[PDB]
UniProtKB/Swiss-Prot annotation:
Its main location: cytoplasm. It is found in: Cytoplasm. InterPro entries: EspG. Keywords: Chaperone, Cytoplasm. The keyword Coiled coil does not apply. This is ESX-3 secretion-associated protein EspG3. Disulfide bonds: none annotated. One of its GO terms (cellular component) is cytoplasm. Disruption phenotype: Deletion of the gene impairs iron-bound mycobactin utilization and EsxG and EsxH export. The keyword Cytoplasm applies. Belongs to the EspG family. It comes from Mycolicibacterium smegmatis (strain ATCC 700084 / mc(2)155) (Mycobacterium smegmatis).
Length: 275
């Protein structure tokens, strides 16, 4: 990979190895980075082979120590106190995972793609600044033009329950409650063609790790970008609300997701915070 002043690109193996050398701990599970070696003989062989890049890159100096910036970034990810897990989904055999990390006041974005992983430190003062990070692995669609509606929770699971029981997708969508004028929209969601990301928030308040039961979804279909965030009904039951995936809407769905955690949202409301 390459080096930068505010970001670095490594191989997933190199990234696991640097975290080992630093004693940073384990990468977040969402990144699905597996150890590239087992015992010392194989660990030594790895350090001897795959280092040449890290010396050429500046990630490791002549004394064998890791660049202090790279080490701080990796540590912000492995010991983050607040975070967003980002599970991107495109075609099969592809692996695109991401995580936004918060440690003290610093923010670091780890984005794993196949055999490479990038660590990017960035300055965030509002959720609106993370939309580009949340929609990175999508298909650059403009927000879809439709009226807000809501389906039962896990509408995709419910839909699949009935497709395996004979009912065609046509009457399935009506059963779920999809407005007639939004049937092509949802049809493209559950039809093979789509790219989406499942977003979940978590923190580490005093000892125990806390995460949100239900997550936020962002779906890119040929009809545009759809935002599906969890809301409650008049009877207190969870439902999946659909709405055009604007940057402001994405920003508010994520903000309310972290606000359900014990330590509230990341960025308190402050006057004058928009560029």
């Amino acid at each position: 990979g390459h080096m930068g002043p505010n970001a670095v690109e490594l191989t997933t193996d190199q990234a696991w190895c640097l975290a080992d050398v630093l004693g940073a701990g384990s990468y977040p599970w969402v990144l699905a980075i597996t150890p590239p070696y087992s015992d010392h003989s194989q660990r030594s062989a790895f350090l001897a082979a795959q280092s040449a890049e890290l010396t050429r890159m500046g990630v490791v100096n002549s004394a064998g120590a890791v660049d202090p910036r790279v080490a701080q970034w990796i540590t912000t990810v492995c010991r983050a106190t607040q975070w967003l897990d980002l599970r991107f989904v495109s075609g099969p055999g592809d692996l695109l995972r991401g995580m936004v990390a918060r440690r003290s006041e610093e923010t670091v974005v780890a984005l794993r793609n196949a055999q490479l992983v990038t660590f990017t430190a960035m300055d965030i003062g509002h959720q609106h600044a993370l939309v580009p990070v949340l929609t990175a692995g999508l298909s650059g669609r403009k927000p879809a033009r439709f009226d807000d509606f809501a389906l039962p929770a896990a509408a995709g699971a419910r839909a699949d329950e009935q497709i395996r029981n004979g009912a065609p997708l046509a009457e399935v969508l009506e059963f779920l409650g999809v407005p007639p004028s939004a049937r092509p929209l949802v049809e493209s969601v559950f039809d093979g063609r789509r790219t989406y990301v499942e977003i979940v928030a978590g923190e580490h308040r005093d000892g125990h790790r806390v995460t949100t039961e239900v997550g936020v979804s962002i779906i890119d279909t040929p009809h545009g970008r759809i935002l599906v965030h969890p809301t409650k009904a008049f009877d207190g039951e969870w439902i999946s609300t659909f709405t055009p995936g604007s940057a402001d809407a994405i920003a508010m769905a994520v903000e309310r997701l972290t606000a359900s955690l014990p330590s509230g949202s990341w960025f308190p409301d402050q006057p004058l915070t928009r560029d």
